[PDB]
Design a binder for this molecule. Structure first.
Ligand SMILES: C=CC[C@@H]1/C=C/C(=O)NC/C=C/C(C)=C/[C@@H](O)C[C@@H](F)Cc2nc(co2)C(=O)N2CCC[C@@H]2C(=O)O[C@@H]1[C@H](C)COC(=O)Nc1cc2ccccc2cn1
Lengths: 209, 142, 56
RNA sequence: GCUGAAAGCAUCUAAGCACGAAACUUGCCCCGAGAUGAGUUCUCCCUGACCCUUUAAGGGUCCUGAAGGAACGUUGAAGAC
RNA sequence: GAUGUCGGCUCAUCACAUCCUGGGGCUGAAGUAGGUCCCAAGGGUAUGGCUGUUCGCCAUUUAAAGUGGUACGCGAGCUGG
RNA sequence: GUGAAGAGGGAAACAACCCAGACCGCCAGCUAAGGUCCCAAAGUCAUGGUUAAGUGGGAAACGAUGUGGGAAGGCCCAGAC
RNA sequence: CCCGGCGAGGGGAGUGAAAAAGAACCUGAAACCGUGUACGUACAAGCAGUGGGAGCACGCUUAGGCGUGUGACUGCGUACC
């Protein structure tokens, strides 16, 4: 089915009566308002565009304001699209709460991973470090060989090298749902999810099942 | 006097439409490339595109002799070392039947900027309907 | 480590295609002194936003 | 393997039909319209007056300067720049 | 009027005459476990003692510790026994 | 015999193979080897056959009711296979 | 006389046949580095030219369809000793 957009509040622990501690990631899932509904006759596919949160009226551009005004709903801090599974039907202005995850039992959480910046092969690709002694000359954490001789005479595409690490879209699948508190707009899922505190998260039910 | 040469600003390019149902792939693409280049015009000029626009319909119904419907392989490389992918004539027809005609014609056209422009005058569709009626394309039984 | 062929004037100019400088889009004007200054900086005389900030 | 002739039989095959593996195509994750074949959808903004002239996708003057963008500044669990 | 060699380290990539896993036929295949041949290259495919060693012997593991090509891959990447 | 000391055309590219020996010029014509569906100049030419393997466009001993043609022979309406 | 740090270095004035003869001084070549104008260039692959060749600009022209510069596209084409 469809998913929801939320914010990562942080992590804590839930104690059960059986003496177990469940690590949970708290996700604030406010009312998700539908801004646009796409069909096949006009767009070529079925989906819905949603928003959540709030934004400074003096900072909302006129194009964005007109997009929300056409739906008759307040503005948010972004826009996200969800596909429909051939049997779902929504309407503009419809508010979707976290109660939609009441009987799912598992979800997939997508977010933007933390940014490590320019990372080395040891950290980015788990390359084995060379000898710290025994004659090593300036080659302790360097990659080593990156190819072969007069044969192909080039470095193959996809070669594992240093470069940007993190700050990319990441999805974690099949996370257990621990609690659904609609009174507080909270969704507790067992385990860690991508991103830092305060980042945006897309929560969809598990597709593997 | 100097031999006549065509001008791309004064050359006349007509529009044609063709039905590919039951037609042999190679024996069809040959006439297309012949017309897309302009060899059928007395004003043919190798450094000018004197060809005509051609619409191809029902590309998903072309014919091939022998067992080429299952033994003909379309290889292509992606750039990575694994790279080498392949698809049969049947697989291509089901996935993207238009590429069968385009690939056959691209190989019969000259290689370079000019031949790359001739290919743009080819409009291939999988069905029997096109959205170029405004150009009034004339039927061509080729 | 070192080149096998001498690069050209062309490639030298291409590399320097990103070496050009950027001029200040505009200079700000003080309310009181009407002097011209960098934005968010004080003037040569010592004014800033018409308040007679440090002059000595 | 089924049915089944050439070959009165037989036969998995020649017509036709059904099963069949971590390989193949998908399904899962990520990039992705410089996909120059440059795509689609929604929304927002601009509704002057003249002159010259080898008179056209022409040039120039005055008025006008939107949406939005950039710049500057405070900065960031973003970042070599 | 210079194409720097063994082995080790780091990083690998392809082939299939396949070591493991997967699918099958025959068996002097009861079962368990094996033998042989066919299909299959998706992924995976030991640590240590001795020796400069590759190899090899030994000890102990593993579903398996595959065979080869890549200047007997890789010193403008390290080492120098 | 050619190259060396020899250009040109053909063999995809290829000093030595095939055709052929460049005094200069021409937006004239006939030919050689080799070729005439498109890339790419010229037959989607004509006539009668073969192949179904993309053989053509890579290869042996050997193996097989693949298929075409030919010369005989054996058993048969006393009823053959 | 003027800008400039009572500078360097320049701009005027003046000398002289000449200051583009001003002492970094007769003549003032080439490599090399620049400003300006015309044309071309951001889907196109390689000794960078050659043959063909559109368009643009400019000069002619007693329109005379010529010349100069540029060179989209295209056939051939792997420097010299
Ligand atoms: C110090 C001192 C060692 C001494 C000389 C050194 C030197 O001159 N360095 C200068 C480097 C020159 C280089 C690297 C030149 C390159 O541009 C081409 C290169 F790689 C190509 C290349 N080189 C090499 C191989 O292929 C080869 O062997 N070497 C290369 C490294 C040294 C070694 C070398 O030559 O060692 C020398 C040793 C005395 C040989 O011992 C032998 O028994 N030799 C031998 C064995 C034979 C058996 C059978 C028949 C006949 C034989 C004849 N000779």
């Amino acid at each position: 089915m469809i998913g929801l957009v939320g914010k990562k509040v942080g992590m804590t622990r839930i104690f059960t009566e059986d003496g177990v501690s469940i690590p949970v990631t708290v996700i604030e899932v406010e009312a998700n308002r539908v801004t646009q509904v796409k069909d096949l006759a006009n767009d070529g596919y079925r989906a819905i565009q949603v928003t959540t949160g709030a934004k400074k009226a003096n900072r909302v551009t006129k194009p964005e304001a007109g997009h929300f005004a056409k739906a008759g709903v307040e503005a948010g801090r972004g826009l996200w699209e969800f596909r429909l599974a051939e049997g779902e039907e929504f309407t503009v202005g419809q508010s979707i709460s976290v109660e939609l995850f009441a009987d799912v039992k598992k979800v997939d959480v997508t977010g933007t991973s933390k940014g490590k910046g320019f990372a080395g092969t040891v950290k980015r690709w788990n390359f084995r470090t060379q000898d710290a002694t025994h004659g090593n000359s300036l080659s302790h954490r360097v990659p080593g060989s990156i190819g072969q001789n007069q044969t192909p005479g080039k470095v193959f595409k996809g070669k594992k090298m240093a470069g940007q690490m993190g700050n990319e879209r990441v999805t974690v699948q099949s996370l257990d749902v621990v609690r659904v508190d609609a009174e507080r707009n909270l969704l507790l899922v067992k385990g860690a999810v991508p991103g830092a505190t305060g980042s945006d998260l897309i929560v969809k039910p598990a597709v593997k099942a | 006097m100097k031999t006549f040469t065509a001008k791309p600003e004064t050359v006349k390019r007509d529009w044609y439409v063709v039905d590919a149902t039951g037609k042999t792939l190679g024996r069809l693409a040959t006439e297309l490339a012949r017309r897309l280049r302009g060899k059928h015009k007395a004003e043919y000029t190798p450094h000018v595109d004197t060809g005509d626009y051609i619409i191809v319909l029902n590309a998903d119904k072309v014919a091939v002799t022998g067992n080429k419907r299952t033994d003909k392989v379309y290889y292509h490389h992606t750039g990575h070392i694994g790279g080498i992918k392949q698809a049969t004539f049947e697989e291509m027809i089901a996935r993207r039947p238009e590429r069968v005609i385009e690939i056959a014609v691209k190989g019969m056209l000259p290689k370079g900027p000019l031949g790359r422009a001739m290919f743009r005058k080819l409009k291939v569709y999988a069905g029997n309907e096109h959205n170029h009626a405004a150009q009034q394309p004339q039927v061509l039984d080729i | 480590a070192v080149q096998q062929n001498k690069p050209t004037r062309s490639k030298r100019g291409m590399r320097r295609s990103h070496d050009a400088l950027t001029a200040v889009t505009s200079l700000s004007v003080d309310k009181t002194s009407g002097e011209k200054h960098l934005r968010h900086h004080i003037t040569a005389d010592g004014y800033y936003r018409g308040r007679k900030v440090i002059a000595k």
